[PDB]
Amino acid sequence: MLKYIIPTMMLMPLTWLSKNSMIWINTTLHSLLISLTSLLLLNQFGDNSLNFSLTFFSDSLSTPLLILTMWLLPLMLMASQHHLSKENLARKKLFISMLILLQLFLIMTFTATELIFFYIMFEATLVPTLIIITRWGNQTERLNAGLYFLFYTLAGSLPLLVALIYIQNTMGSLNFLILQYWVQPMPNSWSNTFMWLACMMAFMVKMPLYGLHLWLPKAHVEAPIAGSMVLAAILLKLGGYGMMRITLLLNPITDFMAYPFIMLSLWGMIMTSSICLRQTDLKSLIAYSSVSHMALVIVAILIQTPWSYMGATALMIAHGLTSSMLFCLANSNYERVHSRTMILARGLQTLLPLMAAWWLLASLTNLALPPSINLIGELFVVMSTFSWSNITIILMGLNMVITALYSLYMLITTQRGKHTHHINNILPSFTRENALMSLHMLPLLLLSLNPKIILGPLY
Amino acid sequence: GWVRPDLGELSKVTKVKTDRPLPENPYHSRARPEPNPEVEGDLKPARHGSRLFFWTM
Numbered sequence: 001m002l003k004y005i006i007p008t009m010m011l012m013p014l015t016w017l018s019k020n021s022m023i024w025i026n027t028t029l030h031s032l033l034i035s036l037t038s039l040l041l042l043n044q045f046g047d048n049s050l051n052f053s054l055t056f057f058s059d060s061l062s063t064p065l066l067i068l069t070m071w072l073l074p075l076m077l078m079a080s081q082h083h084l085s086k087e088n089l090a091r092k093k094l095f096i097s098m099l100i101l102l103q104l105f106l107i108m109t110f111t112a113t114e115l116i117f118f119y120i121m122f123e124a125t126l127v128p129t130l131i132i133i134t135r136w137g138n139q140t141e142r143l144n145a146g147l148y149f150l151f152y153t154l155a156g157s158l159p160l161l162v163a164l165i166y167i168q169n170t171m172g173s174l175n176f177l178i179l180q181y182w183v184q185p186m187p188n189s190w191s192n193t194f195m196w197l198a199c200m201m202a203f204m205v206k207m208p209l210y211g212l213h214l215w216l217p218k219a220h221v222e223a224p225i226a227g228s229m230v231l232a233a234i235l236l237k238l239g240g241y242g243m244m245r246i247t248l249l250l251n252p253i254t255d256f257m258a259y260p261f262i263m264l265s266l267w268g269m270i271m272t273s274s275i276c277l278r279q280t281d282l283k284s285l286i287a288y289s290s291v292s293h294m295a296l297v298i299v300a301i302l303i304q305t306p307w308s309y310m311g312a313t314a315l316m317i318a319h320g321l322t323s324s325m326l327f328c329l330a331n332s333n334y335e336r337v338h339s340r341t342m343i344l345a346r347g348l349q350t351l352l353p354l355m356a357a358w359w360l361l362a363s364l365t366n367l368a369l370p371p372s373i374n375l376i377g378e379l380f381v382v383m384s385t386f387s388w389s390n391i392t393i394i395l396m397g398l399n400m401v402i403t404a405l406y407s408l409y410m411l412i413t414t415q416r417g418k419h420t421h422h423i424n425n426i427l428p429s430f431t432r433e434n435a436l437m438s439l440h441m442l443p444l445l446l447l448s449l450n451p452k453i454i455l456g457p458l459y
Numbered sequence: 460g461w462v463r464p465d466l467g468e469l470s471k472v473t474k475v476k477t478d479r480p481l482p483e484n485p486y487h488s489r490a491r492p493e494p495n496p497e498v499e500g501d502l503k504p505a506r507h508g509s510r511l512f513f514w515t516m
């Protein structure tokens with residue numbers, strides 16, 4: 001994995017020694033070359049995971065998250081170079097350094113062979129994200145949002161540190177490859193109940209769980225666009241990745257410890273979709289949609305069937321691409337009307353027809369239109385939760401109805417109807433904006449052709 | 460016929476011929492505890508280094 005860590009570190013002298021008009025182009029070009037190179041991780045096998053060294057490995061779960069992570073950096077550089085155009089050159093290089101450094105932390109977060117290295121990288125991903133939100137966020141609430149983002153994650157993760165060091169003292173190792181063969185059953189006791197909570201609540205905060213999601217519609221809203229892209233596309237999926245690793249160790253106690261959290265997520269996907277029906281902020285509507293989509297991934301990890309893991313990793317990749325594109329569409333209107341109020345700019349299909357086509361396709365992937373991998377992940381989670389209990393089909397179907405409702409309500413509100421008369425700075429769509437939309441959508445549609453590379457370790 | 464000692468003589472350390480045995484344990488000390496073992500052997504490198512969680516040296 002060192003052949004990806006070293007070029008990501010070499011993006012730092014590439015962004016600090018570049019000419020002052022070349023610091024976006026060079027980082028975009030070489031991060032696209034790293035994203036091209038990311039496809040060598042598809043050397044996967046049906047029995048063995050691609051095990052590089054004592055420190056790094058990549059199974060078929062970490063590999064799509066890695067390719068999505070290394071693909072997200074040039075798109076964040078494209079999205080964030082217009083509103084940081086008038087920035088100081090040094091602060092612009094600091095923003096690009098925080099993006100590169102967050103990618104550097106993530107690509108060795110997902111490949112961490114040993115779990116405390118995963119914890120160090122996992123909590124290292126707070127610091128560039130916190131700096132991006134609280135420094136290049138736009139409104140006043142970015143400082144409070146950075147507080148909530150920091151102090152939910154550390155409140156969840158500092159019991160996780162004690163849990164992992166306890167496993168290190170008991171099993172003798174936190175290597176995940178050794179713990180695939182030295183895993184012992186975790187019986188019913190109060191000690192093992194709080195063991196389960198300490199191993200799971202950090203990732204429940206990072207997904208986010210319903211009831212603990214209150215960091216998210218302030219951190220995802222008050223960030224800039226690159227912060228919103230990385231938070232929606234990768235940093236929620238760190239939680240699901242950690243769950244799919246750490247639920248190896250939590251059996252059979254998960255089979256009754258999962259019930260309150262399965263209730264919280266099965267009811268939170270209804271409640272947050274209902275919240276999306278009544279949002280005035282478009283960016284907050286996309287934030288609560290992200291909570292609504294990650295609730296299904298939480299249920300799919302907690303029921304731990306193979307169909308549920310396949311649907312959960314497919315839905316994680318699909319939601320990363322879809323939510324990143326929805327935030328970029330929201331930014332493309334915010335850079336014209338300078339307001340996140342959804343009812344302000346109306347009738348935009350009369351003005352921006354191809355951008356409205358991108359709105360249509362992202363709203364169709366948001367409502368899980370087949371054969372998109374959105375529908376593949378959605379559908380496999382619904383199959384596995386039906387096999388779990390036959391009455392969960394009511395909640396899954398009601399969630400799908402409300403999901404279609406807020407997706408097409410977002411589309412109709414922003415794009416349809418009579419246009420707003422007093423708004424006259426609606427520029428045509430720039431080539432940068434349409435290129436950003438297509439670089440989100442076209443991989444998301446091409447992955448419907450060959451979807452087996454995003455279905456996890458147990459496809 | 461007695462001669463008075465000179466200045467310096469009655470503070471000399473003299474030797475005494477006795478017939479009683481030397482006291483072999485005058486403090487009545489019991490048996491001392493056996494010491495801890497010494498360290499011995501050649502000093503090999505640490506097996507796989509520090510073994511601190513993931514540090515491979």
Ligand SMILES: CCCCCCCCCCCCCCCCCC(=O)OC[C@H](COP(=O)([O-])OC[C@H](O)COP(=O)([O-])OC[C@H](COC(=O)CCCCCCCCCCCCCCCCC)OC(=O)CCCCCCCCCCCCCCCCC)OC(=O)CCCCCCCCCCCCCCCCC
Pocket residue numbers: 353354357358360361364365369370371372442445446448449
């Ligand atoms: C590996 C090789 C692969 C080769 C094949 C590629 C397969 C598909 C890839 C993606 C295709 C969509 C991308 C283009 C559309 C987006 C941009 C746009 O609006 O363009 C309009 C524009 C023409 O319109 P315009 O009037 O000039 O301007 C737009 C208007 O202003 C206003 O616009 P508008 O509203 O009038 O028109 C938009 C219209 C609006 O219509 C809709 O939105 C209706 C669509 C939904 C209902 C119908 C489809 C339902 C699902 C069935 C089909 C899939 C399964 C079929 C198989 C049988 C059943 C199993 O949408 C379309 O016409 C899209 C046609 C294709 C639909 C594909 C599904 C999209 C729906 C959302 C996801 C669904 C699940 C995923 C499916 C993935 C399948 C691969 O198109 C172009 O100029 C084309 C540009 C180049 C496109 C290249 C696409 C592939 C690129 C891949 C590059 C790398 C691989 C190399 C292969 C390259 C091959 C060329």
Ligand SMILES: CCCCCCCCCCCCCCCCCC(=O)OC[C@H](COP(=O)([O-])OC[C@H](O)COP(=O)([O-])OC[C@H](COC(=O)CCCCCCCCCCCCCCCCC)OC(=O)CCCCCCCCCCCCCCCCC)OC(=O)CCCCCCCCCCCCCCCCC
Pocket residue numbers: 001002005006009010012013053054055056104120513514515516
């Ligand atoms: C004939 C006589 C002469 C023969 C010469 C033969 C050699 C020819 C080449 C000579 C040059 C050799 C250079 C060092 C060898 C490579 C070491 C290495 O990659 O270890 C992999 C090491 C473990 O991976 P592995 O696959 O198990 O081992 C592969 C090798 O067998 C590794 O071998 P190993 O098993 O022996 O590794 C030992 C152990 C293996 O490591 C472990 O056991 C795991 C613990 C590693 C530390 C974890 C710390 C976690 C918390 C901190 C997070 C830091 C975030 C990253 C940095 C953020 C920004 C500063 O390493 C350590 O304990 C050292 C600590 C890490 C320092 C690595 C060396 C850096 C030198 C250059 C520094 C430039 C700045 C780089 C950024 C600073 C941080 C690295 O991975 C990391 O530590 C990840 C980070 C990558 C390391 C730096 C890459 C070296 C080249 C950098 C050039 C680009 C600079 C860009 C500009 C500056 C930054 C903005």
Ligand SMILES: CCCCCCCCCCCCCCCCCC(=O)OC[C@H](COP(=O)([O-])OCC[N+](C)(C)C)OC(=O)CCCCCCCCCCCCCCCCC
Pocket residue numbers: 152155156159162163166191192194195197198201202205
């Ligand atoms: C997001 C915010 C909330 C985060 C919640 C995080 C999870 C909640 C529960 C955490 C419990 C503490 C970590 C437990 C680690 C378990 C390791 C272990 O070996 O356990 C078995 C050990 C067993 O002891 P032992 O290991 O010494 O003995 C060997 C095992 N037996 C007993 C079988 C012989 O458990 C404990 O020692 C105690 C575990 C419970 C500790 C309760 C104190 C914390 C209370 C909850 C605080 C939650 C956060 C509050 C603040 C939030 C922010 C303001």
